[PDB]
Swiss-Prot record:
This is Lipoyl synthase 2. The gene is lipA2. It is found in: Cytoplasm. It catalyses: [[Fe-S] cluster scaffold protein carrying a second [4Fe-4S](2+) cluster] + N(6)-octanoyl-L-lysyl-[protein] + 2 oxidized [2Fe-2S]-[ferredoxin] + 2 S-adenosyl-L-methionine + 4 H(+) = [[Fe-S] cluster scaffold protein] + N(6)-[(R)-dihydrolipoyl]-L-lysyl-[protein] + 4 Fe(3+) + 2 hydrogen sulfide + 2 5'-deoxyadenosine + 2 L-methionine + 2 reduced [2Fe-2S]-[ferredoxin]. Residues 34-257 form the Radical SAM core domain. It comes from Thermosynechococcus vestitus (strain NIES-2133 / IAM M-273 / BP-1). Keywords: 4Fe-4S, Cytoplasm, Iron, Iron-sulfur, Metal-binding, S-adenosyl-L-methionine, Transferase. Its EC number is 2.8.1.8.
Amino acid sequence: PSWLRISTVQRLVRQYGIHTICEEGRCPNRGECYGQKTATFLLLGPTCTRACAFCQVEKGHAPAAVDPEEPTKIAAAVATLGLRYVVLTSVARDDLPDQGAGQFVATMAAIRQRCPGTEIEVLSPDFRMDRGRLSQRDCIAQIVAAQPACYNHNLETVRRLQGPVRRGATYESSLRVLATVKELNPDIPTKSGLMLGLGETEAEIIETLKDLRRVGCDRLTLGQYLPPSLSHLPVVKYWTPEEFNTLGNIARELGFSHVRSGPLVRSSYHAAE
Ligand SMILES: CSC[C@H]1O[C@@H](n2cnc3c(N)ncnc32)[C@H](O)[C@@H]1O
Ligand code: SF4
Ligand code: SF4
């Protein structure tokens, strides 16, 4: 498809022994982003045990050990890069009693102590593997209590494609994450993104936007699914820039703000707005 086509961050992240979901998945947007003094740090990895077929994070049989210095190392990187807006995400940690929620909270505290004024957005997993543990709701509540600038949780695809696309997450559980944020503190903006091109139809995309608005999702991103080289999950369709633009407008008309819609968009792209 024709329309689909420096190292100072790269140096520091490599130097502090930390990880960005960014400089891992070779994100077409860095430098626009880097240029804007943002980046997305990946906590609790670098490997994930879940099986999402679209995701380029290295898979592993065992969870990586939790680094108690990861929060402070991220804060140091933020301070040294002079980042103004930071996104924190993580791999799913179904093995941990709090499913990793504490690591977000610690990292946010470390950043605020060292870099006052830097705004922090969270892209969380679903925390749904709750059985006999701290509840999904309380994992979310721990993070919401730290007052992120935005709480992002991606629905990724429409209802029909949840199984093959995100074997291990669900439509309802991910909707619930977004609903829960607004129940706990309606003043925290919420965000969700979808990847297009996996076989979903425009009718289904609209239904999914309506479902997001029903749980009060303030912000939307739409981008194109790009299959990882050895992924068994095929791309079905390349959505055109015009199609993304008309969907972007539809989203705005349904009440989303900070809408970002385009082939190379990801939920962290231009998050600072
Ligand atoms: C912003 S970094 C994480 C998000 O980027 C998006 N993303 C991950 N992998 C891909 C991919 N192969 N193609 C398009 N978007 C992706 C997914 O929505 C994910 O939650
Ligand atoms: S859980 Fe999040 S990090 Fe792990 S595979 Fe799925 S998308 Fe990647
Ligand atoms: S889009 Fe998100 S993930 Fe890609 S570069 Fe910008 S911050 Fe990193």
